[PDB]
Amino acid sequence: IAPITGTIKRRVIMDIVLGFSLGGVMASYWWWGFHMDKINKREKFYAEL
Amino acid sequence: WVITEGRRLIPEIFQWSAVLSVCLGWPGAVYFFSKA
Amino acid sequence: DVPTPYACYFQDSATPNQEGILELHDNIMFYLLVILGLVSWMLYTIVMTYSKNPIAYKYIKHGQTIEVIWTIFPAVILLIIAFPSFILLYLCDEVISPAMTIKAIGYQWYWKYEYSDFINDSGETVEFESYVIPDELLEEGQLRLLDTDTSMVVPVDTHIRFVVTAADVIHDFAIPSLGIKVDATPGRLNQVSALIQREGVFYGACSELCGTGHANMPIKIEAVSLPKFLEWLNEQ
Amino acid sequence: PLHTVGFDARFPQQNQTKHCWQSYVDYHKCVNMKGEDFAPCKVFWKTYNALCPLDWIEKWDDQREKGIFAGDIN
Amino acid sequence: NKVIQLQKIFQSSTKPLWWRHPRSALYLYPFYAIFAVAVVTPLLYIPNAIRGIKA
Amino acid sequence: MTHLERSRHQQHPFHMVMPSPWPIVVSFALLSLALSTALTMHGYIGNMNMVYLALFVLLTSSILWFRDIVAEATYLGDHTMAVRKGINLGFLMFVLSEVLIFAGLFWAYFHSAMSPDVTLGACWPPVGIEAVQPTELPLLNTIILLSSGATVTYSHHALIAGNRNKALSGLLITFWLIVIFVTCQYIEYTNAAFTISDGVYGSVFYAGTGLHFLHMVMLAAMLGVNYWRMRNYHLTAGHHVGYETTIIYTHVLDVIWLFLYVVFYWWGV
Amino acid sequence: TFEEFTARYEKEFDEAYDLFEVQRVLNNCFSYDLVPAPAVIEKALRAARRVNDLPTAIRVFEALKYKVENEDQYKAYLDELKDVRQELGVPLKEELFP
Amino acid sequence: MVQRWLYSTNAKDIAVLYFMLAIFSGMAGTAMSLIIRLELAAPGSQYLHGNSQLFNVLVVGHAVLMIFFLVMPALIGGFGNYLLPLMIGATDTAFPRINNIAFWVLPMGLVCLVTSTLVESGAGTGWTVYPPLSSIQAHSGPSVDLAIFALHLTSISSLLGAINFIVTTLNMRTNGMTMHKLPLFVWSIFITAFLLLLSLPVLSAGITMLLLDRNFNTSFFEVSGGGDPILYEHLFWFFGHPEVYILIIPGFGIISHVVSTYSKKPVFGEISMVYAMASIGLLGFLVWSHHMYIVGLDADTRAYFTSATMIIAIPTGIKIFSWLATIHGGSIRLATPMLYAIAFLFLFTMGGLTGVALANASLDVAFHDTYYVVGHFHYVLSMGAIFSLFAGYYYWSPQILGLNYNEKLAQIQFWLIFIGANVIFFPMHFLGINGMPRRIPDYPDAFAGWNYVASIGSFIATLSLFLFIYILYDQLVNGLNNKVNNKSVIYNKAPDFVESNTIFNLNTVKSSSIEFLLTSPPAVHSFNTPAVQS
Amino acid sequence: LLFSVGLFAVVRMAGGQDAKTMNKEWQLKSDEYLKSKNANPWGGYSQVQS
Numbered sequence A: 001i002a003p004i005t006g007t008i009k010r011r012v013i014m015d016i017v018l019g020f021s022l023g024g025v026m027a028s029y030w031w032w033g034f035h036m037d038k039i040n041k042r043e044k045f046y047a048e049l
Numbered sequence B: 001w002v003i004t005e006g007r008r009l010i011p012e013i014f015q016w017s018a019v020l021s022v023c024l025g026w027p028g029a030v031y032f033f034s035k036a
Numbered sequence C: 001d002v003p004t005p006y007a008c009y010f011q012d013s014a015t016p017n018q019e020g021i022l023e024l025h026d027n028i029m030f031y032l033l034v035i036l037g038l039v040s041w042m043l044y045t046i047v048m049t050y051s052k053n054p055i056a057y058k059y060i061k062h063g064q065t066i067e068v069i070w071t072i073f074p075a076v077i078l079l080i081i082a083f084p085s086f087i088l089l090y091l092c093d094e095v096i097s098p099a100m101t102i103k104a105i106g107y108q109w110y111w112k113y114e115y116s117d118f119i120n121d122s123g124e125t126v127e128f129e130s131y132v133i134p135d136e137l138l139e140e141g142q143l144r145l146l147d148t149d150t151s152m153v154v155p156v157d158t159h160i161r162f163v164v165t166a167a168d169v170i171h172d173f174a175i176p177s178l179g180i181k182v183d184a185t186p187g188r189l190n191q192v193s194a195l196i197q198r199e200g201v202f203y204g205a206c207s208e209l210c211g212t213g214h215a216n217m218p219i220k221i222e223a224v225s226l227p228k229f230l231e232w233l234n235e236q
Numbered sequence D: 001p002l003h004t005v006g007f008d009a010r011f012p013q014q015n016q017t018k019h020c021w022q023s024y025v026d027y028h029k030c031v032n033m034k035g036e037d038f039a040p041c042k043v044f045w046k047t048y049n050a051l052c053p054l055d056w057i058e059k060w061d062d063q064r065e066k067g068i069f070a071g072d073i074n
Numbered sequence E: 001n002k003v004i005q006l007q008k009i010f011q012s013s014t015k016p017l018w019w020r021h022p023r024s025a026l027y028l029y030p031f032y033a034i035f036a037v038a039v040v041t042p043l044l045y046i047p048n049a050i051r052g053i054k055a
Numbered sequence F: 001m002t003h004l005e006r007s008r009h010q011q012h013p014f015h016m017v018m019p020s021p022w023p024i025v026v027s028f029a030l031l032s033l034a035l036s037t038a039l040t041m042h043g044y045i046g047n048m049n050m051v052y053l054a055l056f057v058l059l060t061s062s063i064l065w066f067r068d069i070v071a072e073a074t075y076l077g078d079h080t081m082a083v084r085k086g087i088n089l090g091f092l093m094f095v096l097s098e099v100l101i102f103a104g105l106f107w108a109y110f111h112s113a114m115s116p117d118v119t120l121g122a123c124w125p126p127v128g129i130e131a132v133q134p135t136e137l138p139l140l141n142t143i144i145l146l147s148s149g150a151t152v153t154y155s156h157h158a159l160i161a162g163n164r165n166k167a168l169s170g171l172l173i174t175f176w177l178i179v180i181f182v183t184c185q186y187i188e189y190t191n192a193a194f195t196i197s198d199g200v201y202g203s204v205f206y207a208g209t210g211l212h213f214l215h216m217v218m219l220a221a222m223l224g225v226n227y228w229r230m231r232n233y234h235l236t237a238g239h240h241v242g243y244e245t246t247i248i249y250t251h252v253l254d255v256i257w258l259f260l261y262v263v264f265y266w267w268g269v
Numbered sequence G: 001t002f003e004e005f006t007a008r009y010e011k012e013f014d015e016a017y018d019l020f021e022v023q024r025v026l027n028n029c030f031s032y033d034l035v036p037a038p039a040v041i042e043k044a045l046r047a048a049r050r051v052n053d054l055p056t057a058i059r060v061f062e063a064l065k066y067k068v069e070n071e072d073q074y075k076a077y078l079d080e081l082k083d084v085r086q087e088l089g090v091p092l093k094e095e096l097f098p
Numbered sequence H: 001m002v003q004r005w006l007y008s009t010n011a012k013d014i015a016v017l018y019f020m021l022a023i024f025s026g027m028a029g030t031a032m033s034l035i036i037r038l039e040l041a042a043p044g045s046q047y048l049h050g051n052s053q054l055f056n057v058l059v060v061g062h063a064v065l066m067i068f069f070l071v072m073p074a075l076i077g078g079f080g081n082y083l084l085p086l087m088i089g090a091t092d093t094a095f096p097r098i099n100n101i102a103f104w105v106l107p108m109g110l111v112c113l114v115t116s117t118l119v120e121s122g123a124g125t126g127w128t129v130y131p132p133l134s135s136i137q138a139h140s141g142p143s144v145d146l147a148i149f150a151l152h153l154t155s156i157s158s159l160l161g162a163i164n165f166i167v168t169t170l171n172m173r174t175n176g177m178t179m180h181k182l183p184l185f186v187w188s189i190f191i192t193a194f195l196l197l198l199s200l201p202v203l204s205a206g207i208t209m210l211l212l213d214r215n216f217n218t219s220f221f222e223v224s225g226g227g228d229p230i231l232y233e234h235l236f237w238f239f240g241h242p243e244v245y246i247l248i249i250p251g252f253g254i255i256s257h258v259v260s261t262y263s264k265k266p267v268f269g270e271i272s273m274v275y276a277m278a279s280i281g282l283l284g285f286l287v288w289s290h291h292m293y294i295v296g297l298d299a300d301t302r303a304y305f306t307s308a309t310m311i312i313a314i315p316t317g318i319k320i321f322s323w324l325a326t327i328h329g330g331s332i333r334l335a336t337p338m339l340y341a342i343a344f345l346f347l348f349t350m351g352g353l354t355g356v357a358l359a360n361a362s363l364d365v366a367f368h369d370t371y372y373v374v375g376h377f378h379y380v381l382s383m384g385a386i387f388s389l390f391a392g393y394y395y396w397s398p399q400i401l402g403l404n405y406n407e408k409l410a411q412i413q414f415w416l417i418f419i420g421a422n423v424i425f426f427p428m429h430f431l432g433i434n435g436m437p438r439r440i441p442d443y444p445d446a447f448a449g450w451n452y453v454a455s456i457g458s459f460i461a462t463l464s465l466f467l468f469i470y471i472l473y474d475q476l477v478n479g480l481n482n483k484v485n486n487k488s489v490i491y492n493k494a495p496d497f498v499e500s501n502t503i504f505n506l507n508t509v510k511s512s513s514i515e516f517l518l519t520s521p522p523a524v525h526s527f528n529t530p531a532v533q534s
Numbered sequence I: 001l002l003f004s005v006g007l008f009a010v011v012r013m014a015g016g017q018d019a020k021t022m023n024k025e026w027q028l029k030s031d032e033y034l035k036s037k038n039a040n041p042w043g044g045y046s047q048v049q050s
C-alpha cells in the first residue's frame, strides 16, 4: 500500500506556480504586446522629427 | 499525479480566462457596439 | 493635447518627464498584474474546487515555511519597484540652467500670466488675463469648457521655469500632457521646470476647488518655434 | 538670446518665497546703505522684477513709503 | 457627619435619584422653567434667519 | 455566607446605573449653545442675552450630573474596587487627549516660529511687538505653581495619615494659591501691549496660555468641591477618587505650564 | 510520523464508548492531509459494529472514496478489506443504490 | 415609552438607536449621489439650472452623511456597542451614562447640518474645509459656522465613545479571557478606539482655529497677518490619513469572522493577524502628507513619505494572503455573507493596487485631484466598507432580531449591487487617466462617454437599495414565518461528512464566540453568573 | 437591469435640452482645428461621438 501523503502540499505548490505563470503572461502581454507597441509608434514620429 | 491533475487543472484555466475577461473587458463591449 | 471620447490611456506626451511618468506607470503595472493574476487565480480555484469539498482539514494553522516567504515576498517587489521611482523624483527638480521664467497667478475663477523676463525690446512685463468663452459667444467650431480667448505661448527646445501663486484662494496649475501640477497657494511661490519637444496645443484645467467658477478655468498652452515666439512677445 | 536667473545654493527647492523677498531687501540695502556703485545693485533688480508677482511690489512700495516695511532697508 | 442619616434616606426611597433629597424641589422646578426658554427661543429665530431678516 | 444570602447581591463587581435624564438634557443644552452662538455672531438676535442663558443652562445641567455621581458613590456606595480602577483609567485617558490638544497648539507655534513669515518681519517675535518679559511677573507664577504641587502633596498624605487639620489646611492654601495664579494672569492680560488681533503672533500666544488659563479656572472649581466634601466628612482615609484625579490634574497642569514657560516666554524672545 | 499516526488512531478507536465518540474520531482521522492506512480503516469498522450503527460503516468507504483520490487505490483498499467487510456485512453505496 | 428610549442606559438599545439613525442618514445621503449622477449624465446643466452652488453643497452633504453619519454610527456605534460587551462577556459598558450622550449629540449635528444647508449661502467647500475658501470673505454667511459645529458634535461623540471602549476592554473581561486570547473583532475595535483617541484632538484644534479665525480675528490662516493656509492641511490630515483606517479596521474583523464560519476551518496564523492589524494603525500615523505631495514640500521629505507609505502594503498583504489560506482546505458554504466576503477580497485588493500606484510622489503629479483618486477610494469605501457592513448585517441580524430574511431575495440584491457598483466605479479610472478633475458640475464634451455609463449604473444600485428596504420590511413583518416555510436558511454551519442529522441536532452551533450561543433576541440582562474560558 | 434601464430613459425625458455643440457638424469642425495643430501623433483626435 502506497502511503498517499502530501496531496495538499504539491497541489498548493502548483496553485501558486500557476498563479505566477498565468500572471506572468498577463504581465508579459502588457509589456511586450501593448507597452512596447506604444514605444515604437512614439519613436517613429520622433525619428521623422 | 500527472494523469490525475490533468483531468481537473487544464479545463479550469480556460474557464479562468473567460470570467476575468468579462469583469475586466466589459467596457470594450460598450465602445464597439456603438461608440457611434 | 485634447481628451478623446472613450479614451483609456495617457494623453500623448510632450515632455521627457511625462515619458518617465508614462514609463514608471507601466513598470509598476508590469508587477501589479502578477499579483492581480495570483490572488484572482487562487480565488477562482479555491472557490470552484473546495465548495465541492465536503471534508475540511481543520488542523492547518501554522505553516512555518510558507509564512516566511509571503512575509518577505512583497518586501522584494517593493524593492525593485522603488528604484525607478527615486531617480525620476530627483531628476524632476533640475533647475540648474533654465532660459526663461513664466509666472502664473490665478485670480479667483481665472488666470493671469505675466512674463517677468525682459528679453522684449519694451523692457516691461507682459501680462494678460485668460477667461473662458461663454456659451452665448461660443463661435462655430470651438471646444466647450476648454477654449479661452487669450492663451500663452512657450518656445520649443527650451528649459522653461514656472512660478505659480494665488491671490484670493488656492487654485492649481495643471496640464496632463506635460505632467506638471503645483498647488498655487495664495502666499507662496512654488516652481517647476519642464522641457517641451514638439509643437502643438495643450489644454489642461484648474484642479483645486476654488468656488463657483471652478469649472470655468481652462489653461490653454501652445508651443511654437523659437523664431515665432519672438515675433509674438514683441507684438504683445 | 534667452537667459534667466541661475540655480542658487541656499535656495535649491520648490518653495521660493524667501528668494524673492531677499532680493528686494538686498536691492534697497544695496542703494541706500552704501550705494557707491550702480552696477552690482542691478543683480537683485533683475532678480525680484523676475520671480515675483507684480502686485506684491506695489504693496511693498506703499508699506515702505508709509514706514511700515517689515524688512530693514537701513 | 450627616452622611449616615443621608445614607438611610437615599436608600429605601423608591423615587428617582434626583428627587430623593428633601431639598431637591428647590432646584428642579426653577430649572425646567429656564430650560424650556433655553431650548425653545433659538428655535423661533430659525424661520426668521431663513428669510434673511436681521434683528 | 449562606448560598441564599449570596444570591441577594450582584454576582459581578460592575456598577449598573439607573436611567437618567442628564445625558440628553446636556445634549439639548449643547444645541442651544451651538444654535444661539451661530446667530449672535451675524446678528439675527440683537444682543448677547441668549448666549449667556445657554451657558448658564449648560453649566447648571452639568452640575446636576455631578450631583448624582457623588450621591451614588457616598450614599448608595456603588463604587467597588473594580469600578474605581475604571474611573482612574478613564481619567488618565482623558488627560492624554487634553495633552494632545496642547500638542496641536505647540505645532502651530513651531510652524510660524522656526521659519517666520515674510509678511511679518524676517525675525521672531514680529517687528513692533513688546513680548512678555519672562523674569518680571511670569516668574512669580512659576514659583507659585511649583509650590502648589508641594502643598497638595502633603495634604494628600496627611489625609492618609489620619489628621484632618493638616489635610484641610493644605487644600485651603492650595485653592488660594491657584486663585492668585488666576488673578495675576488676569493682571498681565489687561496690561499687555498686544491683542489677539495682532497678526499671527497674538493668535498662537493667547491660544496656548488662554487654553491653560481656562483650564486653571476649572482647576479651582475642582479644588473647591474637595474642600466642601472633606469638611463635611465625605472623603475617607482610604477611598477618595474625586481627590486623586484632582492631584493628577494639578501635577499634569504644572508640566504643561513649564513647557509653555520655555518656548512661549524664553525661546520666543 | 505515519507509523506513529497509525498506531495512535489504532488506540483511539479501541476506546469509543458511544455513537457520538465514534463519529467524532472518524471525523478526526479523515480530517488529516494523509489518507489513512488500511490498518486504520479496519479498526474503524469494528467500532461501528460495537456501537451498532450501520450507516456510519457505509460512510467509511464513502469517506475513503473521496479521500483516496485514486481509482485503483480505492480498489487496493477494496481488495484487502473484502474479508472484513463481507464478514461484517457492510454494503457499498453503489451496491446499495440509496 | 419615553423612559426606555429617551433615558436609555442599556447598551443594546443605544446600539439599536445608532442603527436606526444610520439607515435614515444612509438613504438621505444616497439620494444626493443620485442627483449628482443625474447632473453629470450629460454635458451641460441638465437638472440643476445653472447653480454651481447647491452642487458643491450637495457633494458636501453627501460626503458628510456617508462618512460621519452612516459608517461611523453603524460599524463603531452600532456593531461595536452591541457585540463588544457580548463577545468579551461584560454585561454592559464601563460608563453607561456617557454612552447615551455619545449618541444623543448626533441628532443635534443633523439639525445643525440641515439648518446650515437651508441658509441662503450654504457650505460649498468640500468635506475638507480649507481655510481661504471657507474664510469670512468668501463664505460670508453663518452656514459653515453651523457646519463646523456639527463636526465638533461628531468629534465629541466619537471621543466619548472611544474612551468607553478602551476601559471596557481592559478590565471587564471574563474569568478566562486573557488579553492574548481575544476575538479579532474586539482587537479591531480596540485599535480603532486608540487611533480615534490620538487623532481627534488635532482635528478639534484645527477646526476651532478655523472658527476663531473667521469670527475672532486671529491670523491663524489669514495670509495678511503671517498665517499659513498649509498649516491647516497638516493639522487636518494628521487626523485624515489615520481616519481612512478607522473606517476599515473594524471592517477587517467582520471579514475575519465571516470567512472562518462558512469555511469550516480556523484562521491561518491569528497572532500574525493581530500584529499586522496593529502595525497598520501604528504606521498610518507616519504617513499623512502623501495627501500633500503637490503642495510644494521638500524633495527629501517626499522621498521619506514615499518610502514609509509603501510599507503599509507589507502587513496589509499579509492579511490578504492569510484570508486566502484559511479557505484553501475547508468546506465552503456559499451564502450571502460569504458572497459579500468573497467580493470584498477581490475588490479591496483591486483598490489597494491602485492605492500603491498612487503612493509614489513622482507619479502622483499625474493622478492627483482627478477621477482616478475618486475611483480609488470608492473601491475601499463603497466596496470595502459598505460590503462588510452588508455582510455583517446578513451575518448577525437573525441572531440579534430573531427574524429571517428570505435568502433568495437577498442574493438578487447582492448581484444587483455588485454589477451596479462595478459599472459606476470602474470607468472612473479611465476618466482620471485622461485628466478629468474632481469637484466640477460640468465637463468638456469629450468626457461624455464613460460618464453616461456610470450614470446608468447608479440606478441599478439605487434599485438594489430599494430592494434592501423591502427586505427589511419583509423581515420585520411576517419574519417569524420565514423560518417556518422554506424561504430562508436556518443553520450557518452544515453537519460534517460523518456527522448524522440526529447528532447535529444536539450540537447545533459550533462557534468560537459567545454571540451565537445567546438566546434570540438576547436578554436585557445577558450575564448574571460570569462565563469561564479555558 | 430592465427596470433600471427603462426607468433611466423615462427620467431623462424630464430634462433640459442638449448642448449646441453635439451636432456632429460641430464635432467634425473641431477636428480641422486639431489636425492643423497636429494634436495627436500616436493616437487620434477624432472628437466624434454623435
Ligand code: HEA
Residues within 6 Å of the ligand: C035, C039, C073, C074, C077, H244, H245, H247, H248, H290, H291, H309, H310, H312, H313, H314, H316, H317, H318, H320, H348, H349, H351, H352, H353, H355, H356, H358, H359, H360, H364, H367, H368, H369, H373, H376, H377, H380, H381, H384, H385
Ligand atoms: C477605507 C478607506 C481607505 C483605505 C483602506 C485606503 C488605503 C490606502 N491608500 Fe488611500 N484614500 C482614501 C481612503 C482609503 N485609502 C480616501 C477617502 C482618499 C481621498 C481623500 C481625499 O483626497 O478626498 C485616499 C487617497 C489616497 C492617497 C492620496 C492621493 C491623492 O490625494 O493624490 C494615497 C497616496 O498614496 C493613498 C494610498 C493608499 C495606500 C498605499 C493604501 C494601502 O492601505 C493599500 C494597501 C493595499 C494593498 C497593498 C493591496 C492588498 C495587498 C496585496 C494584494 C498583497 C500584495 C501587495 C504587494 C506585493 C504590494 N490613498
Ligand code: HEA
Residues within 6 Å of the ligand: H022, H023, H026, H027, H030, H033, H034, H036, H037, H059, H060, H062, H063, H066, H067, H070, H071, H074, H126, H127, H128, H374, H381, H382, H386, H389, H390, H393, H421, H424, H438, H439, H440, H458, H461, H462, H465
Ligand atoms: C461611505 C462613504 C461613501 C459612500 C457609501 C459613497 C457612495 C456613492 N457615491 Fe460618493 N463620495 C464620498 C464617500 C462615499 N460615497 C466622499 C468622501 C466623496 C468626496 C466628496 C468631496 O469631493 O468633497 C465622495 C464624492 C462622490 C463623487 C464625486 C463628486 C465630486 O468630486 O464632485 C461621486 C460621483 O458620482 C459620488 C457618487 C456616489 C454614488 C453613486 C454612491 C452610491 O450610489 C454607491 C453604492 C452605495 C450605496 C447605494 C450605499 C448602500 C448602503 C447604504 C445606503 C447603507 C445601508 C446598508 C447597511 C446598513 C448594510 N460620491
Ligand code: CUA
Residues within 6 Å of the ligand: C106, C108, C109, C110, C170, C171, C172, C206, C207, C208, C209, C210, C211, C213, C214, C217
Ligand atoms: Cu480655480 Cu479652481
Ligand SMILES: [Ca+2]
Residues within 6 Å of the ligand: H038, H039, H040, H041, H042, H043, H044, H045, H046, H047
Ligand atoms: Ca448635466
Ligand SMILES: [Cu+2]
Residues within 6 Å of the ligand: H240, H241, H242, H244, H287, H288, H291
Ligand atoms: Cu491617507
Ligand SMILES: [Mg+2]
Residues within 6 Å of the ligand: C172, C183, C207, C208, H369
Ligand atoms: Mg489639491
